[PDB]
Design a protein around this ligand. Structure first.
Ligand SMILES: [Fe+3]
Ligand SMILES: [K+]
Length: 329
């Protein structure tokens, strides 16, 4: 069998997955790669399913790539997203802090504000913004969750526990770990800001561009820079929190079907990648944004053989994570 079982988180990803299954099925040889769809409530359930041989592949934020390499799962990174263009591909992106024009505050004046995150554990939504703001947080700083809940005056951290940390779900009651939470992910953290529930969205550089097509509406938003100034959203290259490694597909170490994962995704990149097909798209969707793969991706690059999360992610970002887990001020 040449079937990749894809893990899709909730109703909408599940739909795009069935399209993906059907179009590949229709425009593929008798012998080529098939994909099957397994619906899960969260990225955590996908990670558990892949370790337990009940699924083969899920695409995860760089932060969640790290998380998934830890025991007893030991998921290995297999295919990387790239952004920008197919000519000069990039395997990183920019963590930006998006705010509404004329809101007043800057970064060392973020205390007491409302925060929209993509989700707990994610690079630009959590790890980067919270690590930089770590010593600004009140004591005690463990647990970290409870202490960012204390810093802001209400938050939305998708995937967090709302019993243990009610405040982290104030802007999105429940802290849903899927698109079913309307304020989950990139597009969801920007909807959280736009609706006026929050003051800052910790998102990627291309987030606003994919959620607001009109430049006149776009100019009512700006970014928070590290020198405590503000700059137009277009000038993200000189006003960003950090550069983070790209979302990756992960797979099992043993019997991971990584070769096939590549074969499927690479063929799928030629048939349905950016601007390639009017029947199906891999990096946009009728059913939502950033489903299965991010909207801002332009295709895929193969991860070198048998490389682990640790190595793929790089020392600067692995180190950035570990420092967050145990620090001092
Ligand atoms: Fe991300
Ligand atoms: K508070």
């Amino acid at each position: 069998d040449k079937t990749v079982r894809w893990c899709a988180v909730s109703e909408h990803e599940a739909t795009k997955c069935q399209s993906f299954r059907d179009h590949m099925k229709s425009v593929i040889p008798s012998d080529g790669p098939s994909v099957a769809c397994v619906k899960k409530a969260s990225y955590l359930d996908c990670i558990r399913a892949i370790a337990a041989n009940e699924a083969d592949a899920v695409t995860l934020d760089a932060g969640l790539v790290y998380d998934a390499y830890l025991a007893p799962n030991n998921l290995k990174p297999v295919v990387a997203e790239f952004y920008g263009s197919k000519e000069d591909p990039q395997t990183f992106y920019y963590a930006v802090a998006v705010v509404k024009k004329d809101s007043g505050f800057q970064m060392n004046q973020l205390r007491g504000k409302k925060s929209c995150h993509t989700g707990l554990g994610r690079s630009a939504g959590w790890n980067i913004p919270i690590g930089l703001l770590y010593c600004d947080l009140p004591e005690p700083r463990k647990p970290l969750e409870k202490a960012v809940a204390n810093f802001f005056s209400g938050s939305c951290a998708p995937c967090a526990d709302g019993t243990d940390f009610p405040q982290l779900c104030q802007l999105c009651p429940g802290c849903g770990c899927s698109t079913l939470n309307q304020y989950f992910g990139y597009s969801g953290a920007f909807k959280c800001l736009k609706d006026g529930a929050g003051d800052v969205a910790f998102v990627e550089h291309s987030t606003i561009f994919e959620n607001l097509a009109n430049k006149a509406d776009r100019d009512q938003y700006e970014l928070l820079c590290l020198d405590n100034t503000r700059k137009p959203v277009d000038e993200y290259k000189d006003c960003h929190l950090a550069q983070v490694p790209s979302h990756t597909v992960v797979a099992r170490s043993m019997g991971g079907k990584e070769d096939l994962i590549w074969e499927l995704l690479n063929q799928a990149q030629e048939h349905f990648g950016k601007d390639k097909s009017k029947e199906f798209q891999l990096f946009s969707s009728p059913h939502g944004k950033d489903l299965l793969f991010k909207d801002s991706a332009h295709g895929f690059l193969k991860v070198p053989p048998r490389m682990d999360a640790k190595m793929y992610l790089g020392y600067e970002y692995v180190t950035a994570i570990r420092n967050l887990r145990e620090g001092t001020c």
